[PDB]
Amino acid sequence: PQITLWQRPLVTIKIGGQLKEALLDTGADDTVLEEMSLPGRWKPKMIGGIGGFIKVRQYDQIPIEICGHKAIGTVLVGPTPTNVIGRNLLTQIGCTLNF
Amino acid sequence: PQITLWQRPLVTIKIGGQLKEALLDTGADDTVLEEMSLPGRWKPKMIGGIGGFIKVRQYDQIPIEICGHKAIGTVLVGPTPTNVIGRNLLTQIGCTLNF
Ligand SMILES: COC(=O)N[C@H](C(=O)NN(CCC[C@@]1(O)Cc2ccc(cc2)C/C=C\CNC(=O)[C@H](C(C)C)NC1=O)Cc1ccc(-c2cccs2)cc1)C(C)(C)C
Ligand SMILES: [Cl-]
Ligand SMILES: [Cl-]
Ligand SMILES: [Cl-]
Numbered sequence: 081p082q083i084t085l086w087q088r089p090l091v092t093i094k095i096g097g098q099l100k101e102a103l104l105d106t107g108a109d110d111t112v113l114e115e116m117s118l119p120g121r122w123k124p125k126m127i128g129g130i131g132g133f134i135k136v137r138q139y140d141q142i143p144i145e146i147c148g149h150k151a152i153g154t155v156l157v158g159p160t161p162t163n164v165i166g167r168n169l170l171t172q173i174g175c176t177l178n179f
Numbered sequence: 180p181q182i183t184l185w186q187r188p189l190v191t192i193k194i195g196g197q198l199k200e201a202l203l204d205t206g207a208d209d210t211v212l213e214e215m216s217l218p219g220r221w222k223p224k225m226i227g228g229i230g231g232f233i234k235v236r237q238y239d240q241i242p243i244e245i246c247g248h249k250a251i252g253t254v255l256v257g258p259t260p261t262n263v264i265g266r267n268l269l270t271q272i273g274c275t276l277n278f
Contacts, residue, residue, distance in 0.1 A: 081277075085205060085269050085274055085276070086266075086270060089276055104276060105204065106276070107207060108206060112229070130226065131227065131228040131232050133230055134229060147278075164206055164229075170278075171185055176181050176182060177188060177203060
């Protein structure tokens with residue numbers, strides 16, 4: 081679709097059998113979700129933003145569906161104050177900025 | 180332009196006659212720049228990021244050029260990891276998300 085930026089660009093995602101609301105963030109390197117369970121291997125990571133760093137768990141090769149577009153990539157899980165979809169997945173669904 | 184997201188969506192902005200690099204960030208309500216000088220009076224704002232809260236100085240009605248596109252709006256100044264261009268100015272320069 082074309083998505084306006086008068087409001088926050090929130091979309092439904094499907095991940096780990098769950099439906100969630102998330103924020104399409106062109107500024108984010110990574111995808112970061114609030115605490116949830118995912119299968120398979122993980123390793124710790126510190127990620128930074130406004131206000132400083134938080135510690136997250138990094139899972140790789142996770143299937144995700146965003147606005148009905150399938151992709152696979154790394155998903156970070158931790159105490160983020162909101163679900164963000166980052167460039168690592170935005171690329172896979174062909175998402176671009178236009179002006 | 181159309182900007183893909185394989186790399187950080189970094190652009191040149193001009194503010195107060197000087198060039199800077201900044202990140203086009205659709206997950207940001209507000210525009211936040213690293214410490215700099217701006218004219219007039221400022222008001223306080225507390226803004227929240229992935230890592231927690233920071234205090235910033237809010238300047239209103241500031242002219243700023245973003246990739247050659249002219250805007251005039253609210254600019255927050257404070258301890259941010261990078262210069263971030265948020266939806267308040269992205270809407271002024273006619274930005275959308277497309278996939
Ligand atoms: C309305 O609040 C905001 O719009 N906050 C904004 C904001 O933090 N939005 N959050 C989106 C993510 C912003 C940012 O792209 C902002 C950003 C920060 C640093 C960088 C690049 C972009 C470069 C440094 C390291 C790489 N870090 C990141 O890529 C991280 C990523 C790992 C999450 N990127 C970001 O953190 C998402 C977000 C949204 C809401 C809140 C709230 C929490 C509680 C109250 S508000 C926190 C985070 C703002 C920049 C104005 C502080
Ligand atoms: Cl990835
Ligand atoms: Cl592409
Ligand atoms: Cl504004």
